[PDB]
Structure formats: structure tokens, C-alpha cells
């Protein structure tokens, strides 16, 4: 049982929409600390970790902590009815459905049946990332679209004063380069020259909900997974871990 209120329904809708393109179902943990959700896509190539602390909500009242199972495409469907001006309310009693309400010019309440979703659970492993890149969502989103013209895969290369994404196909190539002089490169910390490759299909889904001016943190290593995170209402966080393409 809970009542949780979030100002700006579309921003919340975008989160769920991104997640729904990677996973079909998720378990959402409503704790006193905030909402958390963790899942892998069925092929176990990508991990999603959503963390929305209670502080980003205008009201956060969890009378009884609870984990609820949700069909992501139907959650998306409903949340996409929210207008930018709408206040979002997520409310749950003892019954097995979630009440989603948009408060704006009218009060619009949807009832979503809840389902059984089995949580796999181990926490994030501590990985020895040798490169950290902070860049504008614009560059990331662009570069991924650029690369898809040419390949199904994109190579990330980090050296101490340059970050490059490159894709090659059949004669055609593209390289997207940032140096510390560039606007869109906010930070670059490199322990050792770092190279890994990733699938464009996954990347595309991952960055769809990212804003052009959002600050996105990339962490990766040589033939290691990519960790990608961006902030939600400052304290919230959506984190992806994406397994590499090797050879």
C-alpha cells in the first residue's frame, strides 16, 4: 500500500517507455527509501536499474512496503496518456492492481492489473572500468544514429584526451570524436587506453529517452560491459549495464 505523487507525468512516461523497449515485464520495489526496479532483458545482454529516491516525489507515502509486477508495454501505454502539465499519482491498496492517475484539467484514473514477475537477484558487480566519459546526450544519440548507417555494431575508444565512437561496414565508415576542447565532452578520465564494442540496436533503445542536453555517464573497459547512466530529477537515476560485442 502506497500513494506516490510525481510532478510531470511525461518525464516519468519516458523512463518506462525506454525500459519497455528492453524488457517485457518488471518488478517494482516500493520501499520507504524510494522506488527501485532491476531487470535483465530475456537474452541477458542488458541490465536495467532504475532508482527513484523518495526525495524526487512531491508526496511519498508507503504505508506498507511492497513489490509489484508490471507488464511494461501496458504501463507505457497508460503513462503515455499523461500530459506535460499533469501531476502523476501512483496508488495501491491491498488489491492486486495499480491505480495510475493524471491530475490536470481533469482527474483521469486508470486501473492496471498486476502480474507475477520473478525477480532474479544479484547486485551490481564491482567492475574494474578503465574509462569514464561524461558527454551530452545529443552527441551520444547522434553518434549511435550515425553509426547505424554503416553497421550493427559500434566501437568505443577512450584515450586520455579523446573519446571516439566508430562504426565500419562495406567501404562506409563513421567516426564521432570528442576532445576535451569540445562542448559535448564534459569529462574524460582514462586509466589506460580503452576499447570495447557494443550493439547498436541495444544502444538505440537505451538512449531513446535521453534528452539532448542531459549529462550521460559512460563507464567501460577493454572488452567489458558498458555502464550508462543518466539522472532523473537530479536524485533519480537510470543505469544500464550492456554486455560487449567481442571479436
Amino acid at each position: 500500500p502506497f500513494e506516490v505523487v510525481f510532478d510531470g507525468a511525461k518525464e516519468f512516461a519516458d523512463l518506462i517507455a525506454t525500459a519497455s523497449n528492453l524488457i517485457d515485464e518488471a518488478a517494482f520495489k516500493f520501499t520507504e527509501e524510494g522506488i527501485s526496479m532491476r531487470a535483465m532483458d530475456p537474452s541477458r545482454v542488458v541490465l536495467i536499474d532504475l532508482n527513484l529516491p523518495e526525495s524526487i516525489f512531491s508526496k511519498y507515502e508507503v504505508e506498507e512496503p511492497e513489490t509489484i509486477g508490471i507488464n511494461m508495454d501496458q504501463f507505457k501505454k497508460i503513462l503515455k496518456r499523461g500530459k506535460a502539465k499533469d501531476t502523476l499519482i501512483l496508488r495501491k491498496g491491498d488489491e492486486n492492481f495499480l491505480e495510475i492517475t493524471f491530475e490536470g484539467t481533469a482527474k483521469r484514473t486508470f486501473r492496471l492489473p498486476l502480474i507475477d514477475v520473478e525477480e532474479l537477484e544479484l547486485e551490481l558487480p564491482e567492475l574494474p572500468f578503465t574509462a569514464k566519459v561524461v558527454l551530452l546526450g545529443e552527441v551520444l544519440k547522434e553518434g549511435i544514429k550515425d553509426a547505424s548507417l554503416v553497421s550493427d555494431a559500434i566501437k568505443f575508444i577512450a584515450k586520455e584526451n579523446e573519446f571516439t565512437m566508430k562504426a565500419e561496414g562495406e567501404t562506409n565508415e563513421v567516426e564521432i570524436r570528442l576532445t576535451l576542447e569540445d562542448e559535448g565532452l564534459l569529462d574524460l578520465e582514462v586509466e589506460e587506453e580503452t576499447k570495447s564494442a557494443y550493439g547498436i540496436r541495444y544502444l538505440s533503445d537505451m538512449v531513446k529517452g535521453i534528452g539532448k542536453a542531459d549529462e550521460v555517464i559512460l563507464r567501460f573497459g577493454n572488452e567489458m560491459p558498458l555502464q550508462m547512466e543518466y539522472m532523473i530529477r537530479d536524485e533519480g537515476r537510470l543505469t544500464f549495464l550492456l554486455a560487449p560485442r567481442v571479436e
Binding site: 537474452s43 541477458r44 545482454v45 542488458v46 549495464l241 560487449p244 560485442r245
Partner: peptide, 9 residues
């Protein structure tokens, strides 16, 4: 090859 995340769990 598209690795899975399993080796890292």
C-alpha cells in the same frame, strides 16, 4: 559475438 552479462554475475 554478442556476450551475455552472465560472466559478470
Amino acid at each position: 559475438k554478442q556476450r551475455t552479462l552472465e560472466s559478470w554475475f
